């Protein structure tokens, strides 16, 4: 019901997908791609899908 909705800052961010180790890319992967370096604010809102 509650998911994250993170607004990035488009100057200090890096637009490509971050590439960790392959076994860690299926666990840590979509977390470090949502809290990517340059997250301005991180909100907890109602889930949209």
């Amino acid at each position: 019901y509650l998911t994250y909705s993170v607004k990035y800052e488009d100057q200090f961010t890096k637009k490509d997908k971050l590439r960790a180790s392959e076994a860690d890319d299926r666990i840590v992967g979509p977390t470090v791609n949502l809290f990517k370096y340059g997250a301005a604010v991180v909100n907890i809102d109602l889930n949209r899908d």
């Binding site: 019901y1 509650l2 994250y4 200090f12 370096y37 604010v41 907890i44």
Partner: protein, 292 residues
Amino acid sequence: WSRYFLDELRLRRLSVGLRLITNPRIARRFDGVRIMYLTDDDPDPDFVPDVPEGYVAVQYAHRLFSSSLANKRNRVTYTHPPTGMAYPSPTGRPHVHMTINERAGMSKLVADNIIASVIKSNWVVDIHDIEYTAEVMTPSEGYTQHVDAESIMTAPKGKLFHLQFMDGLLRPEPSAFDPPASGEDMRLIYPLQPISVARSMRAIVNHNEVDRPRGAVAPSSYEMDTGTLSRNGDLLYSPVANGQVGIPKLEVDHISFSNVVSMMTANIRTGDDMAVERVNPDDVRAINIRNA
């Protein structure tokens, strides 16, 4: 007790859902607003500007503002309820902390004279009927749309606005030889209650001078606590010490983003079509009925 003509399970899910509605993490319908003409150097949506030391609170009514012949021109005149003096020009009104509570039956010239009195005479005007949402604008995005002071004063009561606030933490610092600009970013409309109750982390960067940036926040320790799964089915946190029964997650008002969900595997198959054998009786005259 007709239990609102509902299921036995549907009330059990309703007791969880009422915890979701009164949660402060989603209650982002902000009521209350403050017109004030203080400057803007460090933008953040948490900033609720303090009322200065020598201001007098005056409750708003229609009796105060009225037309009066002042200097060869009919000017709208304020009558300050402590002293009772007449104040026809907004250039020299005393510092009044007016608290508008109704905003109904109010003229457009009276609303013109108050917003003129904020800019010219440094008033602070609280309005407690304005409902609005807030989106924290990132500084590279900029303010997409503004909100006019004509709409903050001359509007029907139940209109839901949309104010845009900017997190000025990640603004680019200017170079040490750039000659300055000219105009200053001013600010007219401020909130009463704290914005960004939905905020979890902020400014995930690393500043080069100090260890952690000014006002950057960390995620709370309850967002990472899985805890165990109880025997009843209530989600518990981790025990804070030895021999401590853990805190159930539906009592406190924090948010936990990792939870133990009891789920069935591929060896259950709830709700398929099971197949039976039916054997009719031998004679219809041989079927016992009573007493059974």
